[PDB]
Amino acid sequence: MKASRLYTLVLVLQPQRVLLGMKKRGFGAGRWNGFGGKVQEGETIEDGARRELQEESGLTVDALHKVGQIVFEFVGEPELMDVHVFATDSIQGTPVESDEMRPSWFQLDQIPFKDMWPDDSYWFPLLLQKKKFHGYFKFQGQDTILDYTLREVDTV
Numbered sequence: 001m002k003a004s005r006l007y008t009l010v011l012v013l014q015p016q017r018v019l020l021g022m023k024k025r026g027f028g029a030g031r032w033n034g035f036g037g038k039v040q041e042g043e044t045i046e047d048g049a050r051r052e053l054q055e056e057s058g059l060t061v062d063a064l065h066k067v068g069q070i071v072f073e074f075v076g077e078p079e080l081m082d083v084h085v086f087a088t089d090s091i092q093g094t095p096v097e098s099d100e101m102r103p104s105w106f107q108l109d110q111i112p113f114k115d116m117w118p119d120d121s122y123w124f125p126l127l128l129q130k131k132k133f134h135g136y137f138k139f140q141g142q143d144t145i146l147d148y149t150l151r152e153v154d155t156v
């Protein structure tokens with residue numbers, strides 16, 4: 001079984017809107033997403049999530065809730081991406097554009113699925129329903145899912 005590398009993903013989810021960022025370079029460029037990246041040596045996963053949110057959007061938070069975990073496999077890539085997904089409703093500061101991301105708010109009846117990773121269509125609705133989840137998706141390239149599993153869980 002492949003080795004895995006730890007990543008974070010943070011969704012600022014308010015009652016009528018969600019904050020996403022347009023990825024300007026790198027992995028997932030051209031897609032709207034939450035904020036996140038590789039966990040670094042010595043930090044907890046939650047602290048890595050807080051750090052990435054600050055670096056990519058300028059925001060800080062008073063509390064981060066773990067809402068899901070998704071493992072990604074790409075054909076032809078040796079490592080799995082083990083993504084720990086967090087949400088918060090209560091941020092401090094305004095979002096700012098970074099080298100990585102252009103933040104923008106979306107109303108919750110305008111979630112931009114066509115410009116998001118394809119797997120987000122499956123798990124994002126669970127997030128919105130306050131349901132914790134575990135997932136796994138195998139991709140060929142950026143657009144094609146070959147296999148996936150998704151489970152509602154009581155504990156992430």
Ligand SMILES: Nc1nc2c([nH]c(=O)n2[C@H]2C[C@H](O)[C@@H](COP(=O)(O)OP(=O)(O)OP(=O)(O)O)O2)c(=O)[nH]1
Nearest residue numbers: 007008009026027033035036037038081083117119
């Ligand atoms: N919504 C969504 N997010 C995903 C998927 N796959 C995936 O890795 N992610 C997230 C996890 C991370 O937030 C981000 C990938 O991390 P990254 O490449 O931006 O990491 P980084 O900031 O450390 O990278 P870099 O500056 O070194 O280029 O994308 C997916 O299918 N859907």
Ligand code: NA
Nearest residue numbers: 036037052056
């Ligand atoms: Na980053």
Ligand code: NA
Nearest residue numbers: 035036037100
């Ligand atoms: Na990133």
Ligand code: NA
Nearest residue numbers: 113114116118
């Ligand atoms: Na999509």
